[model samples]
Target: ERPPEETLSLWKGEQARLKARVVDRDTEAWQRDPSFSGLQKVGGVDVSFVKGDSVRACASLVVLSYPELKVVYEDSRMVGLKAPYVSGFLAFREVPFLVELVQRLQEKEPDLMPQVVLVDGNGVLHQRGFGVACHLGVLTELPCIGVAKKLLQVDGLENNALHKEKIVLLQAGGDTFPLIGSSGTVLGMALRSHDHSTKPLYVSVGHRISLEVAVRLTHHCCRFRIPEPIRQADIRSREYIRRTL
Candidate 1:
């Protein structure tokens, strides 16, 4: 499913407009700290579609106590997907609902709001160099990190022979390699988030955070292959959908 060409054009315009506001550097004191000191809460968000319907989806936002990595607040809500699924435009499809979740937390539990958010998608590592994570970070003006399970081939980055070789070299947790785009920009880092896991997590700067800090925080958040906050949000969202169904 896809949107019309005109709608795609509009999304492009919105993305470019927001792209300018995305800060790829560390803006918060906690971000530059060696241990991310002063960072008390970390957040994660996701949107899971119904098993048989694309339009019916659940948006979940979970905040966890940092280091301890225990869930403190959870919000999962069923929402209608207003736009069709279009590559490079997923924010238009799902970010509004996520923004709503953030706003709800700000309204009812402002004191418990997270210091930083980990998004389950790309940031600047997109076809247009602006992904869902960047979109959310700009909208909320919150520091966010992008963590994706799979590599997104953009700017001549491909999952090919050399990539596989690089992956094979990831011997243990915290191991990483820079994702240099064809333009020579270091877009993100492929990190081995945990030991005994072959697959790597793609970590990128969403907004108001630097790539190095984002990668470090991502690795720290991972108790498993997936970071705990994101894992909790995903698990809770799917469970919510199952219960509703």
Candidate 2:
């Protein structure tokens, strides 16, 4: 069944209202540096759903020591996904549980809080420029970056021949190009996370970070194709789901 028209309307209203709160700037001192000099802890969040049971999924938040990229704290829990609807705005549903994880971390281990969070989704690169990462950042008041595996393709951005041709130009790790929209906003960047990888990670500023710094920091966090914090959160969440439910 389709969601009620009122529900869709509500989602649209919320997205637009919250979009104003999104800060597409370098809010932290670490973000101002060329190499993110003072940054240490990097956080990542992911929710891996069960194949047969969408309600039963592992919601995980992991913090890793920056530059070194080692996990120091992890909060992986089996959460009931209560939100409905899916597709372009499906990311909205994941925010509540993610906010819970961030709050729990603050309450339990304030010292382990990450300076920046790397979400496995989009930020300003969404249909209305407020994706999951943006919502999470605003709600949690932390710097968040969206690192997506595939392009969302909004605002005249398409995965076409020209896009593929640009992809071919990214011959090495850290090579990147801006994802400029028809409106002329630099939405995000298509980044080659590693030298040997053919695919690029779509990086966007979630909140409290700029597009340039978000792209650079994500590239720096890459030990492979995916950033370490997010990759570890994904891996550990899957592993937790297998063992528990």
Candidate 3:
């Protein structure tokens, strides 16, 4: 009979090495490029854990035709859980599901691939200088942005939220923490977009995506406090988790 307890180790228990191998990518040029112009199709990738240790992850790709919104491709992955919760290492907890989902999408909807992905987490805003967004982006070779809800460090902020092209230095805890606001794609646009009550969304470049574009697409896809893709993914995660339990 299968063990009643839920404890499974698949990566030979080497979580840190697994993360480094997965997050090893070079996107320096993309980060430095002035123009982050491209809007054929964008994806909102999010992961949610289910009861009994499995995970239900969803990739909601919103194909953009300029000012029009359309769902070109959608995919979901139901994969086994790999890592448990580790502070500053949430990427390991959620990334396996994300990687599997991305692979499934590639196999099922190859034609509907997205040029960019808006991840509902952090990118460069991490304790190790690379958040989940950056980790996944490097692993998948996909351009992604980290958009998180809260601050995870105790440093002065690295203001990706610049008043101009020049990046600002943030001051919070004596040491500045690097942060980017949602502003790319349509710089200064999200602030004036619909649903004017939403507070500032944290933004950072994970890998092939720019800081400003991350913000622009976020405002475009955002219909509520959470973006449509993430909101739907969260709903799916909760729904399925409840069912399994």
Best by lDDT: 1
The global C-alpha lDDT for each of the candidates, from Candidate 1 onward, is: 0.92, 0.91, 0.54
TM-score of 2: 0.97
| Tens digits of per-residue lDDT for model 1, 1-245 | 66789989988998999899999998999888898899999999998878678879999999999999999999999998888877788888888999999999999999989999999999999888899999999999999898999999999999999999999999999999999999989999999999978999999888999999899999999999999989999999999999989
Error of model 2, residue 124, in angstroms: 0.5
**Candidate achieving the largest TM-score:** 1
Against the hidden true structure, what lDDT does model 1 obtain? 0.92
Q: In model 2, which residue pairs have backbone atoms overlapping below 3 Å? A: none
Residue 190 lDDT (model 3): 18
Q: Give candidates' CA RMSD values in order.
A: 0.8, 1.1, 8.6
Candidate 3 lDDT (Cα, 0 to 1): 0.54
Q: Rank the candidate models, highest TM-score first.
A: 1, 2, 3
In candidate 2, stretches whose alpha carbon ends up further than 4 angstroms from where it belongs are none
Candidate 1, clashing residue pairs? none
- For each predicted model, how many residue pairs clash, with residues at least 3 apart or on different chains? 0, 0, 14
Over 87-187, each residue of candidate 3 has an lDDT whose tens digit, in order, gives: 55667678766777778778877766666677877776665556777777877888876777654542444433442232122221111222433332211
